[PDB]
Scaffold this motif. Structure first.
Motif, short mmCIF file in Angstrom:
data_model
loop_
_atom_site.label_atom_id
_atom_site.label_comp_id
_atom_site.label_asym_id
_atom_site.label_seq_id
_atom_site.Cartn_x
_atom_site.Cartn_y
_atom_site.Cartn_z
N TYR A 81 0.78 -1.24 0.00
CA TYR A 81 0.00 0.00 0.00
C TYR A 81 0.82 1.30 0.00
O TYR A 81 0.26 2.39 -0.11
N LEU A 113 -9.09 4.88 0.24
CA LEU A 113 -9.63 3.54 0.01
C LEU A 113 -10.01 3.33 -1.45
O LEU A 113 -9.53 2.40 -2.08
N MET A 116 -8.26 1.05 -4.37
CA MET A 116 -8.95 -0.07 -5.01
C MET A 116 -9.01 0.07 -6.53
O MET A 116 -8.75 -0.89 -7.24
N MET A 135 -5.51 -0.87 -7.76
CA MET A 135 -5.35 -2.32 -7.71
C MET A 135 -6.05 -3.03 -8.87
O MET A 135 -5.42 -3.84 -9.52
N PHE A 184 -12.35 -3.43 0.56
CA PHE A 184 -10.91 -3.24 0.49
C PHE A 184 -10.14 -4.42 1.09
O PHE A 184 -9.15 -4.87 0.51
N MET A 237 -10.69 -7.47 -1.41
CA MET A 237 -9.92 -7.21 -2.61
C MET A 237 -8.41 -7.31 -2.36
O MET A 237 -7.70 -7.87 -3.18
N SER A 238 -7.94 -6.89 -1.19
CA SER A 238 -6.56 -7.07 -0.78
C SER A 238 -6.17 -8.53 -0.67
O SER A 238 -5.13 -8.90 -1.19
N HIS A 239 -7.02 -9.37 -0.06
CA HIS A 239 -6.78 -10.81 0.05
C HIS A 239 -6.79 -11.47 -1.30
O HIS A 239 -5.89 -12.23 -1.64
N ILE A 247 1.60 -12.89 -0.67
CA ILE A 247 0.75 -11.82 -0.11
C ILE A 247 1.39 -11.11 1.08
O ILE A 247 1.10 -9.95 1.33
#
Ligand code: PFL
Ligand code: PFL
Ligand code: PFL
Ligand code: PFL
Lengths: 484, 484, 484, 484
Positions: A259, A270, A274, A277, B248, B251-253, D257
């Motif tokens: 991040y 946020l 997203m 990403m 968030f 989506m991060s995972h 990750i």
């Protein structure tokens, strides 16, 4: 002079136009066509259009890098150096908008290039003109002048208008595609290599613009206390530290590595994170797709030889052939093709008559010229005869012809040692450059001796059916064949 | 009126039904078939089934987004607006369940559409009826009414029952597949593009549902002190902040970029995080697989020309041809095919007689009509003769025909300059549109002059074997050929 | 002795040279060629060049690992063990530079190996000599000696010069490629496996060098207080902890898993981290491209059988064949091909006459030798007849021949049970190894009985057209066929 | 009884053995072969070997999960339940080691299964016996007994020996491969689906074992104060929390990750983390390679139709055909092939005579049986004639035959409306099921009328050359053709 002025705007006789129109007289018809389409028209394949688009591509690659940095990381663009850059660029992008009403279009059906001014104009209005117009004019400066008839809301709303210049990207994509289609039919390009380098340029640019966006959204909100610029305490830093951090933050999101210093806290951070990403993970999957297609293009010959071979293994497996028979077949394929896949009958059928006789003379004239039957003959018969030779390979210990069997072919040794054997004589060896079986042309019935390959023979054969077919066309030779 | 009511439920004569059944009289047989299968049956290819499924797809895409948000982020769904949404949706999904007992099925063998009510009913019960039933009825509301004959256990157990509505996804997948099979045989679709956009929709939906799951599992445990919602101190936030964070985190995972604010601490957060990682990493690998297949579909013509060419290089390598002979072959392939791969003999064999003669007249009539041998002839002979022309390309300095060699073909110049040469005359040039070699049709033996390509000739040839074959079918022309 | 000294430097008669030049007499011409090209020349395919390049590859793989560690993690390289390693390596890399003026080059057109000293010299200067020179000489030690005619600036600037040795990598890439081209035409290599293991070696080396770079850039800045080495408080650690951390940091960036202990803080750490991310993400996408190409090479036979089958399903779908007819066709394809894709006509056409008759005798002699028509015949007729047999498969209940229909083929059972049936007799079964239909060779008109497959018959057929063609070549057999 | 005991150990007559050996009499020869190879031998294709390997696969999948958990997360395995599990498993894995001296081997050349006890024994010793032996015996328990003739070093060294049981994985890989080769020639398997599910099982197992390794290396070092188990303060937790954390840590490293709660600190945690990253990133790239190969197998028919079509576009582009001619060709391809790629001539050549006449009767008998020329004929002539019909498609407004042109073919309408036109009559329409052109069989010269397609005609044609060829074989029909 007007000779060079009109010479620049018509399709010049060159490598590309000769291959596109077919002949110098076809180019000179298209030249006459533009020279009578209207005043001062530009052919898409002109040298003027080439050099103009080369200036545009250097302008666009520079503006699309510099503009979002200047908008995001500098306090105002109302100072003289930024006014000079933006006015000088916008006039050049407005000349380009004007020349697109003068430039003919390549048709999807390859029909006669659209050169009527009313169709060149009408097709541009129905397509790219609105996107090219709003990215050409200085919309932020005319709006600022209209406002002169609180400051910190206007200085922020003009930044959003100032980014309408990013739609220049559509011209960059269009003009890159048009010159790649031209260089493909000019310079022998691997398509996957070209598409890889276009994607790398686009990925670096998207990362750069996301880097500006990471800082721009905080800036337009006046750096609220819950955003990354305030949390990392860098609102007062130099433009180069702020840019470097913002780029690192964008690149971290887009490569999915992290991040930045911490996970987002505010709703803007946020949703901007997203967005970054999703865009970056999509773009990385497209990059992996292009890398995979490039890598498959690079060993296609080897892949195809392995697929061919694996079908030979399937044949031997279906018939349940013994392991030593399979080794003998595998060993033949390696000597007969030397790891190379090609289809000689298709390749020779695609050539013209000059290229076929040039290849056949290179392969076979050094063999057949030494034989007394052909050393007496006219070259236009020899070239016809050499085209009937068939290449054959034999393994050690194979009988090429057996004594007492019916003769149907003659043979010329290119490589390897053979041996002729009989009860009436010693085992006479024959080597690279010799020939045997010759009597079969001028007889019937039994071969007089056995010929067996001692090493791997590579040899050319001529059959009696083909030797007779090549003598139906040459009656003046048939009398010598019956008399020598 | 009953004319329009029964007209809506039978397969209409349109683009798709004409191509599926073969003719308007075949459609009108299938119409009569449904019009006598039973009362009020629906054909799968009807306009009514199209418009109903279009309403279903808009309902499903809306419910599968809104339902898990409403269950997860709102305190109860017993208020009037949520009762209205859930009752109005459930009646529409129950009409859809009923119409599936009235709608015929497409068979995997393309046999006559299943239209007997007893087979349409019996096949639905053996397949999707149980999944379609338990996702159609309001299972949470009937259970809540049965409970009226402590509250915080029931208000939580009903949330799990309320998510049985997510099995609507099976209808979304089924009805999308059925309309893609229909639009494929209607609208000229690239299969890899269609499969990419279906996967993007599914990935966004899985991320959205994982986002709800990240918060739902804490919620059903009453936000224990070791979960992410308590650790980040957001149990009392508005639904939009909680949703944004949870999305968030999911989506991060799933993109494998990180955990959110910190790594998991509780056993629920560990196992929900690991589930999200495995599902997301699997889904990203499937996305990269689809991106790779899309990218290979997009330059297939270029890939195939490069594979073809690389086999020509393998042929020249196997024969060890000299570097200038290889450059001459490479230069011929670029002028002869212009970077395009196609097989003209296969393409012309697949066409009908009208399309072949239409293409042949476009290519060759402008050449051969100028020659005095054919300017006198009947069009049905000319079209038969033009089909025997063979396209040939020659490089600069190639001899097309040599003096004293036997004549077998005539030639028509499409493009390029040739020159005819002899001791008895000057070097007469011949240009685009001319013809030569004509005497070979009406003689035997030697050509009287040499013809050599000065530029790249593109030309059509006619052989004596084919000119004679096209005159066996036209005896009324053979007398003029012997007399003109 | 000079016999072994000159024997080492010329292309030896072996597996590779025999396949490259074609025959032992072709090798012995190339030997004589080098033995008269100049004093002490090295052929590229020599045993000396093999063993020298094998020493070079062991030197290069060792130096490219050890050198950047020695420069980065040790205080100075002016001590005796480092002077010995660097001088001993640099003399070996300088002998290699000298031998490249003595070694002939393989030409891209496979023409006669470049062996004139003036062309071997002139081509090396126009290519790799400058990169091979500046990585061969001890540029850091000659510069240090030139400085002897403040210390902490020189001890740091010499580290940057000392890394000019990393350009040895160009020789490693070149010499690996040259020996892979040789082992491909020697040892039956899958191309995708070879390219995978080369890429894994390169990826590990890039990660190792990035690991050194992560620490080197801080070191050259004297470990400023905002860099990762100072922040993690490890400036005074042992070389093995510092290396392990730096490698972990590089590998974290390049696999995109994280930053190390924290995100970057200084401008050097930001830009070195971003460089590492871009390089590593590019390299991982190339690795996924190679893995994909390897995996497609590994089940190519199965992929190709499925593509073939799916076109058979498309045919049955286009013709709308009934489901039981489709099951009968599917069931035939599984018994007829047994999951194997091959094209028998192409495979047999590519073989020589010895291999075809060897395969045909293995398949068919055990069947046809039992029949009284052929038990009397000469082997050179039997082998000609066996080549006309065609393999056919029949399903249970199929009529192979029907009574009263015209006879055109005979059949030999390889496997399965057939039964012959008539009103005049019982249902006589026929089993694996038997034959029937024989009368059709020596008659005209009607078959006398019906033959129907009871199990799946696998059988060979001989047609009357082919039996007559194989008797035109054997008049001495036609009299026995009319008399037995 | 001994009848069932020997029946179990020989290859039973079933779906697989019938397809592998070719006939029930071939199976019964292989049965007799094993029934005389030695005492109590096991054929690889037996029911006993199937059921034994099914027990082994359930044992192996259970032991390879449970063993590394039991070794890592429990204080000792000297208690009764662990002694019972390890002794019961080890005896079953020792029976399996013994039965491999009794079980025949499938040969790579598909030759007669190796069944001599001396070759079955000798080939196992030269291959897998050493790996199968050291993973079968309880090496940790015999070592512990040998030690009874400080405790915390022995209790730790025995854990490393106890993991020699993980080499059972080699039997799991071997026995999975052997049963997939058998189920491939039994059950119609997509190869890419099978390889995907094998890889998913392997990935989950590697993640599980890395999860045990993350905790095991700290455990063998007695949980030093700088390791993750001490830093996260969980040395005293229950086995299920420790396992869940360790699995989360492994899965985080392998999916790239993150690290867990923090980056590594000790040298053991650094190197175990880097090992996990390299293994996991390699395994994810192989997974993406398999996903890509699966996805390319799933729309192969559509990919191939698009490649075919794109070569038709290249042909029209090379010839510069007009846009309306290109639309007419595109429109013909969509009606003629309906999006389906197949090669009808190859498919019909691969079939047998029963299947070809069964398909031809389904397509064409409903057309040709209505015509008076064929309604009188014998079925064995009609089937021969129907095989000469060629399918043709015509667009609206195409002339199928023109008045006054020479007749060469007859036509039968399958679908669409045609119309016949002349000056002597009205425009008579002809519909699906009718026929025209019939007079051309029994005449010469001019067609009497024009036939033009009004809708898209789908129709079958019969040429005079083929109608005459099918009457040379039927002289008894030629007299009726001259008289009706
Ligand atoms: C958008 C940007 C961060 C990006 C994404 C995907 C791939 C690359 C390169 C490293 C190939 C890249 O720079
Ligand atoms: C499940 C979800 C987070 C997801 C996974 C994989 C790929 C994508 C897009 C960015 C293509 C995606 O949104
Ligand atoms: C540069 C380095 C960190 C690297 C990148 C990509 C892939 C791999 C292996 C794991 C295949 C790798 O070691
Ligand atoms: C080793 C393990 C963590 C792993 C690696 C790669 C891919 C997967 C699944 C999600 C396909 C996986 O479980």
């Amino acid at each position: 002079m007007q000779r060079q002025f009109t010479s620049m705007l018509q399709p010049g006789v060159n490598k590309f136009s000769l291959r596109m129109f077919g002949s110098q007289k076809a180019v000179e018809k298209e030249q006459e066509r533009v020279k009578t389409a209207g005043f001062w028209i530009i052919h898409p394949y002109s040298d003027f259009r080439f050099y103009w688009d080369l200036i545009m591509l250097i302008m666009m690659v520079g503006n699309l890098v510099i503009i979002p940095v200047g908008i995001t990381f500098f306090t105002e663009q109302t100072t003289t150096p930024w006014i000079i850059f933006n006015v000088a660029s916008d006039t050049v992008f407005l000349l380009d908008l004007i020349m697109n009403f003068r430039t003919g279009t390549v048709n999807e059906d390859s029909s006669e290039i659209i050169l009527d001014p009313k169709v060149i104009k009408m097709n541009y209005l129905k397509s790219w003109f609105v996107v090219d117009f709003i990215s050409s004019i200085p919309v932020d400066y005319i709006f600022l002048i209209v406002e002169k008839g609180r400051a910190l809301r206007i200085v922020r709303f003009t930044k959003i208008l100032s980014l309408l210049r990013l739609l220049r990207l559509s011209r960059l994509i269009r003009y890159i595609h048009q010159w790649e289609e031209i260089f493909h039919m000019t310079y022998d390009l691997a398509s996957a290599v070209v598409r890889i380098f276009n994607l790398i340029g686009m990925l670096l640019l998207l990362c750069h613009w996301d880097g500006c966006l990471q800082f721009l959204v905080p800036l337009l909100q006046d750096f609220p206390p819950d955003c990354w610029v305030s949390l990392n305490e860098m609102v007062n830093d130099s433009w180069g530290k702020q840019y470097s951090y913002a780029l690192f933050k964008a690149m971290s999101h887009m490569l999915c590595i992290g991040y930045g210093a911490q996970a987002p806290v505010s709703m803007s951070d946020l949703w901007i994170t997203m967005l970054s990403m999703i865009v970056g993970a999509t773009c990385y999957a497209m990059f992996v797709g292009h890398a995979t297609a490039l890598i498959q293009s690079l060993d296609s010959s080897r892949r195809q030889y392995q697929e061919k071979y694996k079908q030979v293994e399937q044949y031997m497996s279906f018939h349940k052939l013994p392991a030593d028979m399979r080794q003998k077949i595998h060993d033949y394929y390696e000597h007969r093709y030397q790891g190379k896949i090609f289809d000689e009958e298709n390749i020779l059928n695609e050539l013209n008559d000059p290229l076929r006789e040039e290849i056949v003379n290179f392969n076979c004239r050094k063999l057949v010229a030494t034989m007394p039957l052909f050393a007496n003959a006219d070259p236009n018969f020899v070239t016809a005869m050499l085209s009937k030779l068939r290449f054959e390979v034999f393994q050690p210990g194979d009988y090429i012809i057996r004594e007492g069997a019916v003769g149907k072919k003659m043979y010329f040794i290119q490589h390897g040692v053979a041996g002729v054997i009989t009860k009436s004589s010693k085992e006479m060896k024959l080597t690279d450059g010799s020939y045997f079986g010759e009597i079969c042309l001028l007889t019937k019935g039994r071969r007089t001796a056995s010929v067996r390959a001692d090493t791997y023979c590579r040899l050319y054969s001529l059959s009696v059916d083909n030797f007779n077919e090549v003598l139906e066309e040459y009656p003046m030779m048939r009398r010598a064949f019956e008399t020598v």
